[PDB]
Amino acid sequence: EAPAAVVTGAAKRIGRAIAVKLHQTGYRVVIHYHNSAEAAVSLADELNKERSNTAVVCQADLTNSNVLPASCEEIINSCFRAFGRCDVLVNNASAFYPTPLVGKTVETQVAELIGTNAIAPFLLTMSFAQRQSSNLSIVNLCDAMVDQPCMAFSLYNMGKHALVGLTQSAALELAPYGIRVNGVAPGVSLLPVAMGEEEKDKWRRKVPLGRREASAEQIADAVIFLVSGSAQYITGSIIKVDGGLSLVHA
Amino acid sequence: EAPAAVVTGAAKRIGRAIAVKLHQTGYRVVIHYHNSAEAAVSLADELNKERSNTAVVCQADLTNSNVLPASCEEIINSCFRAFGRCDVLVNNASAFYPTPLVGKTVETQVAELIGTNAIAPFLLTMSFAQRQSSNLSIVNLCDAMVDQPCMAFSLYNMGKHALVGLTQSAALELAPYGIRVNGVAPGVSLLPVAMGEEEKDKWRRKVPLGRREASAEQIADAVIFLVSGSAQYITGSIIKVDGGLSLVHA
Amino acid sequence: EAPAAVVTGAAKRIGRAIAVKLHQTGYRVVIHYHNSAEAAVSLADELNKERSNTAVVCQADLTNSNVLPASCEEIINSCFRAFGRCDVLVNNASAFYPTPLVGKTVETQVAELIGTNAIAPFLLTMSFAQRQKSSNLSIVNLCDAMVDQPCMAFSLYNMGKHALVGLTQSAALELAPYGIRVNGVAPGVSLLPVAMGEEEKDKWRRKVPLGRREASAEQIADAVIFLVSGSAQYITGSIIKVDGGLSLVHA
Amino acid sequence: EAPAAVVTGAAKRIGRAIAVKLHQTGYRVVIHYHNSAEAAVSLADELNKERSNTAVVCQADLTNSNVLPASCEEIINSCFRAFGRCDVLVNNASAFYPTPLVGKTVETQVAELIGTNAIAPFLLTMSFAQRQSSNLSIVNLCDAMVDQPCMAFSLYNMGKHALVGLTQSAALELAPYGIRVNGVAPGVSLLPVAMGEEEKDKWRRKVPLGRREASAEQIADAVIFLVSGSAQYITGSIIKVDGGLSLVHA
Ligand SMILES: NC(=O)c1ccc[n+]([C@@H]2O[C@H](COP(=O)([O-])OP(=O)(O)OC[C@H]3O[C@@H](n4cnc5c(N)ncnc54)[C@H](OP(=O)(O)O)[C@@H]3O)[C@@H](O)[C@H]2O)c1
Ligand SMILES: NC(=O)c1ccc[n+]([C@@H]2O[C@H](COP(=O)([O-])OP(=O)(O)OC[C@H]3O[C@@H](n4cnc5c(N)ncnc54)[C@H](OP(=O)(O)O)[C@@H]3O)[C@@H](O)[C@H]2O)c1
Ligand SMILES: NC(=O)c1ccc[n+]([C@@H]2O[C@H](COP(=O)([O-])OP(=O)(O)OC[C@H]3O[C@@H](n4cnc5c(N)ncnc54)[C@H](OP(=O)(O)O)[C@@H]3O)[C@@H](O)[C@H]2O)c1
Ligand SMILES: NC(=O)c1ccc[n+]([C@@H]2O[C@H](COP(=O)([O-])OP(=O)(O)OC[C@H]3O[C@@H](n4cnc5c(N)ncnc54)[C@H](OP(=O)(O)O)[C@@H]3O)[C@@H](O)[C@H]2O)c1
Ligand SMILES: COc1ccc(-c2c(-c3ccc(F)cc3)[nH]c3nc(N)nc(N)c23)cc1
Ligand SMILES: COc1ccc(-c2c(-c3ccc(F)cc3)[nH]c3nc(N)nc(N)c23)cc1
Ligand SMILES: COc1ccc(-c2c(-c3ccc(F)cc3)[nH]c3nc(N)nc(N)c23)cc1
Numbered sequence A, B, D: 001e002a003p004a005a006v007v008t009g010a011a012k013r014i015g016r017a018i019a020v021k022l023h024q025t026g027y028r029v030v031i032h033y034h035n036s037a038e039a040a041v042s043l044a045d046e047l048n049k050e051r052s053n054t055a056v057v058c059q060a061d062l063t064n065s066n067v068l069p070a071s072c073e074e075i076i077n078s079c080f081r082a083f084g085r086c087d088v089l090v091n092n093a094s095a096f097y098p099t100p101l102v103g104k105t106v107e108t109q110v111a112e113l114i115g116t117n118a119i120a121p122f123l124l125t126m127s128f129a130q131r132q133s134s135n136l137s138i139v140n141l142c143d144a145m146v147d148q149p150c151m152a153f154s155l156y157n158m159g160k161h162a163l164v165g166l167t168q169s170a171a172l173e174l175a176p177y178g179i180r181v182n183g184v185a186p187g188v189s190l191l192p193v194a195m196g197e198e199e200k201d202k203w204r205r206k207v208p209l210g211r212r213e214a215s216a217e218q219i220a221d222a223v224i225f226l227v228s229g230s231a232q233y234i235t236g237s238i239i240k241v242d243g244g245l246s247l248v249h250a
Numbered sequence C: 001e002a003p004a005a006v007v008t009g010a011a012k013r014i015g016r017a018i019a020v021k022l023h024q025t026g027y028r029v030v031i032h033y034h035n036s037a038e039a040a041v042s043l044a045d046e047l048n049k050e051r052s053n054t055a056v057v058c059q060a061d062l063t064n065s066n067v068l069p070a071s072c073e074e075i076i077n078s079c080f081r082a083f084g085r086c087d088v089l090v091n092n093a094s095a096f097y098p099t100p101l102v103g104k105t106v107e108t109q110v111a112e113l114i115g116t117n118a119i120a121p122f123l124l125t126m127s128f129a130q131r132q133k134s135s136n137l138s139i140v141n142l143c144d145a146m147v148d149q150p151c152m153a154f155s156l157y158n159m160g161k162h163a164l165v166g167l168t169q170s171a172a173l174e175l176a177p178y179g180i181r182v183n184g185v186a187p188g189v190s191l192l193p194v195a196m197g198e199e200e201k202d203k204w205r206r207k208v209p210l211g212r213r214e215a216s217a218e219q220i221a222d223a224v225i226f227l228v229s230g231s232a233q234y235i236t237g238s239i240i241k242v243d244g245g246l247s248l249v250h251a
């Protein structure tokens, strides 16, 4: 019988490549999404057309609130309800926007940025662990630039630092169950086309390896390795996939 | 005219030692507290006996909620109300208890450990910046053992990692305003009186330097250094004060 | 035709497993060794029996000295001599023994610990890059998951392994324009000497959160294979811990 | 009676500022030097004029060779000869120049960059330890940009990483003797007097805190703090004194 994985924020961009690559490797997958319903549903169709009964969809807001624990439990539950098991969790979903220290409320900024990037990953991790031969693991989408943060993204960066903390703490705490917890830390990948050519190339010119952003597939490759049998002794590790961007001084 | 400082969770233990050492250095202090009313006024009493009108108390719960931003604004506001300025913020209050992955609810556990250790510091930092030959700085109380966490303290540890991220991001963004932002990372300090001499010795003997815990004063000494004119070019630095504990492998 | 790799200290233990796995992946291999000549030739024979003309040995002392640059240069040269190319360098060879701060002279200690763990890796990287000026060129340095929590009395070893982290980063940055990726793999406790005491063996096993045992050489090798592969093409400057959570365990 | 200190590369720039501060705080100093004999002897003279026989010079090449151990031992011996004791060692001397991976020979680059930045510090540490109300400590001059290194400075950068491991390894190992081992990590300080101001400003503009390099004195202030009684629980720590520079992404 095939293993199953939950991928958050999986309707597009990096989460989609991850869900696609896990599916190609043999996984059944739960495509979590928030607002991208059409793309989630359309991906589920694509994957199911390739192999029947291997993909479902689960909508949830991962903003921090008093009902976030039950939503995270719902997400993990979908995977069991559809597939009867849950082997892999990929914490990919993430809010990302500036939150200057000096038009949505600060409460909402904290809830969105800390909820998606950290608290939801923690609650999902609880629900995953609570519901457990096997190769169980969690992969958290972290950030190669966490120690050289973008100006005015303090809550995003707090969120991501907290994700590193969770990766470590859950790796220690869940190792007795044979659940590995690791991370993949992208540099720059999938530049928005909202973005100017000048600004894109300015970012591209900073990357040592190839003067280019990562493709979503390259990020997914790292995730796949971490869940694979070739990573069985690896827990609490964060693999940068940044083309050397973080090594470049100001 | 004396500078003024806010110390969070200043009624006892490390916070009190910070507030005390700041006051001796010539600062007027706002002694924030949550539950320890008696200890807080008893400290302010004592400090005011030495120097008239140089200390006030200020009660605030620093648990995360939709009113937390107003609470943190009010703490900063209290310093200005009493003293007409706010030069120094020390983020010291911290909730601390196990939150296993497998009768506080989890929503409460998230709110208290992530609110106190991270979100409240963010919001106090926002409010501090917003209100501004000065020497303005923030010092965050961090944790030297953040990369080798205690078992079943994932939320606490998430919050302490988030505080590192804030220290860095805020150091960066507030540098243009002359506000330095730094941390002190204690090891083991002030063992609970509750604990048996067995368990105390066990922690003590882990410390390479002298097999003893840090005194409150030793922690305060590092804080005072960071706020002083001797740390004028220092920003985004976190100073361990751990007697070498973080270096000791398992 | 098949790519080629140099693996230093490859006659035995972790380097042997890395050489094996690269070979099974399709690489031709230079098995470098220092004293373990019998094991090296045995290993070359066994790989060549599997695919004729795909393995050579190359003997060298990697202690620091005024001729280490020439020795490191010759190791690279011998992969070009045998196979016409050098696609992968794995810096694995390493001297490991206490050097307390309070038989061998201290100058010998310095030369061996810093030479093998850091300076030979630097010099081999230089030679590798120099000889370069359908290809996936990379270097993998065998680092150490425990470097920020060192063993007591192992200061020169630790200084070496920290230096190697630096080389990994500096070389990643500098060799990126040439398409040469540089990365690390950082074992925890792995492949315990069968010789060492069982009691001591258990002591260390018991410390590892994941499975309560040491890594197998093959587990370390898996991470090298990943980093040299086409699935790691945007990865440079990274060090992958393969430690079962050992570095996360406080005192 | 007064404590004594060995400062390596103390004839000029940051070393000199450290020697002077230490002396101003009450230390007797050994002014080590390599080529700057005029500046070394002249410093010793200015300090002795201030307090009789409180300064001596000591010349030594700290390039790695077969004689470096004896040279390092003779440096410590010079302290005991002059003052009957040696309480503090500051590892400051450092070669710094590019060594591209692609007319000194390479073995001489290795010898100088690794000798001065790591191996001499190690040997000086050994001889210091061997020779031992007491406050004994070592401050190693590290580098805040070690993880974002300058292009083509691999040997320097290796040397400075190595110096981090020494700081850690030696802290752990010498704690039982009450010898603390810490470091200070400048960003950019004391730009070359010969570098064009227009080049100098390219670096200054990178610094968040004040768009300025550190003064020699600002770096020395951190050293003074680490050697003081205010830092008696601090070992294994590296204090950045970098104005934010290492937080700035490419
Ligand atoms: N792109 C990069 O260069 C880069 C760099 C560093 C780190 N990373 C990390 O790698 C991961 C993927 O990056 P990405 O650029 O592909 O991410 P992204 O597209 O910015 O976000 C991925 C998904 O997160 C989901 N999301 C956002 N807010 C949410 C909420 N409140 N509740 C639930 N889901 C929410 C969205 O789902 P819907 O579309 O369904 O609304 C979105 O599609 C992220 O964790 C990111 O932080 C990426
Ligand atoms: N002690 C150590 O060994 C150690 C180790 C590593 C890091 N640290 C860090 O250094 C700092 C000081 O440590 P400590 O042991 O002195 O701290 P603590 O005694 O555990 O906590 C300090 C204060 O935080 C306040 N606090 C707790 N929950 C709160 C809430 N929901 N709202 C507002 N305030 C709240 C409490 O105030 P009231 O009493 O007024 O209720 C308490 O007096 C902390 O930030 C800590 O994490 C300490
Ligand atoms: N085993 C672990 O738990 C562990 C933990 C952390 C890191 N690592 C790292 O992983 C790598 C491999 O580990 P390992 O245990 O397999 O290594 P090892 O057995 O200690 O050493 C591997 C080989 O290094 C070679 N070597 C030693 N001194 C040399 C010299 N002066 N010149 C040339 N070669 C020399 C030896 O070759 P000959 O036999 O031919 O003399 C030896 O077989 C090392 O870089 C190590 O630091 C291992
Ligand atoms: N300046 C910065 O911005 C910066 C940045 C990061 C780190 N740091 C570190 O902070 C420390 C002081 O920096 P700095 O700029 O003041 O250093 P520096 O001027 O570059 O060099 C300090 C002294 O090192 C001595 N030295 C050089 N080669 C030597 C050798 N082969 N043997 C013995 N001594 C030798 C020289 O002594 P003589 O003049 O007597 O020959 C020189 O005056 C250094 O460790 C440096 O790496 C500085
Ligand atoms: C120039 O185009 C981009 C800029 C930023 C992101 C991005 C990052 C990110 C953070 C720090 C950093 F140094 C580089 C990237 N984290 C992100 N997290 C999420 N959920 N979405 C993103 N789109 C990003 C993606 C593309
Ligand atoms: C053995 O007696 C103690 C045990 C823990 C703490 C403590 C820590 C802490 C965290 C990790 C670690 F390795 C050592 C200490 N963080 C803390 N944070 C707060 N707000 N209060 C505390 N009381 C502690 C204080 C004394
Ligand atoms: C309990 O039996 C072992 C003890 C040490 C090693 C070892 C390490 C190592 C260093 C620090 C640490 F925390 C764990 C392992 N580095 C090594 N490096 C080399 N070149 N060979 C080795 N044999 C080792 C292997 C097995």
Ligand SMILES: COc1ccc(-c2c(-c3ccc(F)cc3)[nH]c3nc(N)nc(N)c23)cc1
Residues within 6 Å of the ligand: A249, D093, D094, D095, D096, D143, D145, D149, D150, D187, D188, D189, D190, D191, D192, D200, D203
């Ligand atoms: C802009 O003018 C300067 C450039 C370099 C240095 C310098 C550094 C350094 C290293 C990395 C980095 F990102 C910045 C500085 N390390 C040094 N080490 C020594 N022994 N001397 C120095 N003179 C420096 C000083 C001034």
